[PDB]
Design a protein around this ligand. Structure first.
Ligand code: SF4
Lengths: 289, 287
């Protein structure tokens, strides 16, 4: 009776790190979990396998005679906590569509019976920036019912969360796909905490957890590992464990309430991220006072 | 002889700011220019029009029903120095496609005769992060002949520069889309200068210009303007005029030579952005 989840968020903010650590803690708790990477951009499996780069289904295709001639074992690779891993692979530059590749990979995993196995969770790690139909395919195709949005207290991360929420709504008139909460990947930015709680509230959801910035996360990283594995006796490990427990016992699943741009900027100015715009100087050259 | 150009690069490194400043410098030089924004998360015309957000072709049709029931005048606006600005409009979250969106905007403007107007340049401001078929459409359709890639001395941005080069490589045999050079948006990083000149070399192109970081940029920005208009006497203005001069006279247009991820990491390490990997302590606990 597995739960299909998706962690969405923009890049450049440690989404993959928080995802893998989250997945590590779950395994530690006694859960069988499978990670399906769906981000063209940042290795969402290296920390579970100590790998520099896991071979993707897409490259194992644009070379190994296309899909039907692939062996599950060459794609799926278990790691720490026996957590199974899989990397979809992004689109062939200039030609492919990220959405299509991701679906082809999921299909493969279903057909080759990868889900018919005793698995508690499955986390799809999707790039959640420009939420085009491509990247929303995991939602349109009912391949993940619970979505958690990794964001931080900065403009683009939040614009991204709003866009990801609009994608979810678009398919709310048809399915179990729901928003389960926001995960704030701290940037040690003032009031980031409150900013995300306020955002969650407006969206109709919750901030499932605040992941602090801890220099241990990076040490466990350049050694290609999660914190939970490096130093289980680390304060940070408890941080993810707290997140792992809350996702397990989470019952809030809603159809988000995207906000407007003005509404979003209001939020930013309200909690001290972006300043109020001085309308008097707009368009004034230096010569003009 | 109108030149069809495009500036490609990832988000978060000042691409649109450099694009608008560069276009500003061209207008100051007498060039009649038009900007067509094709970036979902970055206003590419706001510094030229002094506005917070320009009505996009997409949302101005979702209104009036559909493109045919649309007036050029409502989509194309002119701002500083006569520069004409058009905003494509990103994809409807969860459903649209950048490839579809850009073609819709290009086709309309062509049908409305926005191009044959005496115009010396057209600049497509395109997000060049994941170079999926959708964001490469301006390439597949030969709408952007000379591409200039904005990048900076950092992994993701150089990686983006590489992926854009493959996109250009992929349609070599069909059109006239070429790589004109790289533009380095300085990030106050040591050697960034050299790093990007090295990358260009590997790619087979040129570092057309190094754009310094300078607070006058943010000060013009906050007033919704380009440095050229805000403070024509500032050194940065000359920095942009220099880039515009090299672009107007540029004749080094090529088909790029992508590199491997390994060839890319070797570059970061050499110029010291990335450190060497301690083989030995991999996955080895610590304790
Ligand atoms: S739907 Fe998205 S990922 Fe797919 S080709 Fe279009 S912009 Fe790219």
């Amino acid at each position: 009776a597995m739960r299909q989840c998706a962690i969405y968020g923009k890049g450049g903010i440690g989404k993959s790190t928080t995802t893998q650590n989250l997945v590590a803690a779950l395994a530690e708790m006694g859960k069988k979990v499978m990670i399906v990477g769906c981000d063209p951009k940042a290795d969402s499996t290296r920390l579970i396998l100590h790998s520099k780069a896991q071979n993707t289904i897409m490259e194992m295709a644009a070379e190994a005679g296309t899909v039907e001639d692939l062996e599950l074992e060459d794609v799926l690779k278990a790691g720490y906590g026996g957590v199974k891993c899989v990397e979809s692979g992004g689109p062939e530059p200039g030609v492919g569509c990220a959405g299509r590749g991701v679906i082809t990979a999921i299909n493969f995993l279903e057909e080759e019976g990868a889900y018919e196995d005793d698995l508690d969770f499955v986390f799809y790690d999707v790039l959640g920036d420009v939420v085009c139909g491509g990247f929303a395919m995991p939602i349109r195709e009912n391949k993940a019912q619970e979505i958690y949005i990794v964001c931080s207290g900065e403009m683009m991360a939040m614009y991204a969360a709003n866009n990801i929420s609009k994608g979810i709504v678009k398919y709310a008139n048809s399915g179990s796909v729901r928003l389960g909460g926001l995960i704030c990947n701290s940037r040690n930015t003032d009031r980031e905490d409150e900013l995300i709680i306020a955002l969650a509230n407006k969206l109709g959801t919750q901030m499932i957890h605040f992941v602090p910035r801890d220099n241990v996360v990076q040490r466990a990283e350049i050694r290609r590992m999660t914190v939970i594995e490096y130093d289980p006796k680390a304060k940070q490990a408890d941080e993810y464990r707290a997140l792992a427990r809350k996702v397990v016992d989470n019952k809030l699943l809603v159809i988000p309430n995207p906000i407007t741009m003005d509404e979003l900027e209001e939020l930013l100015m309200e909690f001290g991220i972006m300043e109020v715009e001085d309308e008097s100087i707009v368009g004034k050259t230096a010569e003009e006072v």
